[PDB]
Amino acid sequence: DCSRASLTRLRRQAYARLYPVLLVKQDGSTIHIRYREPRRMLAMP
């Protein structure tokens, strides 16, 4: 089950707010990540 480990909470000792963005891959696949800045999407070249 891929979602078994995907869903987790940040247990790090303090951190800056991370905003959700998608790293769009060249094959059309997408992956959710938490990024420091309030961006929306990222593109892999």
Partner: protein, 101 residues
């Protein structure tokens, strides 16, 4: 009849938490499966953005156990890697002295 060597697993992911969260998760599965884990090391950030990589040590494996284990690892993944591997304390040496004396 030959037995597998100790194979380290390098888990590199975009998010430090996700890499570690998978690294701890596999250890839990490893412990349930009776897989010995010597250490869970973390590598430095790949400064250029950065990436986070964690080593999960695995020791002991069998032909049938290998087949099922890696299949489970593939499904469990939400970048996998499998590779063969490459200060003692006072009580440890004291026993060591007697053997060689």
């Amino acid at each position: 009849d030959y037995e597998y060597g100790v194979l380290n697993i390098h888990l590199t992911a975009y998010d430090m938490s996700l890499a570690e969260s998978y690294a701890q998760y596999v250890h839990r599965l490893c412990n349930r499966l009776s897989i010995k884990v010597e250490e869970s090391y973390a590598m430095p950030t790949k400064t250029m953005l950065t990436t986070h990589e964690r080593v999960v040590q695995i020791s002991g494996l069998s032909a049938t156990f290998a087949e099922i284990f890696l299949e489970v690892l593939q499904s469990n993944l939400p970048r996998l890697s499998v590779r063969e591997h490459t200060f003692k304390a006072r009580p440890e040496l004291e026993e060591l002295l007697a053997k060689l004396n």
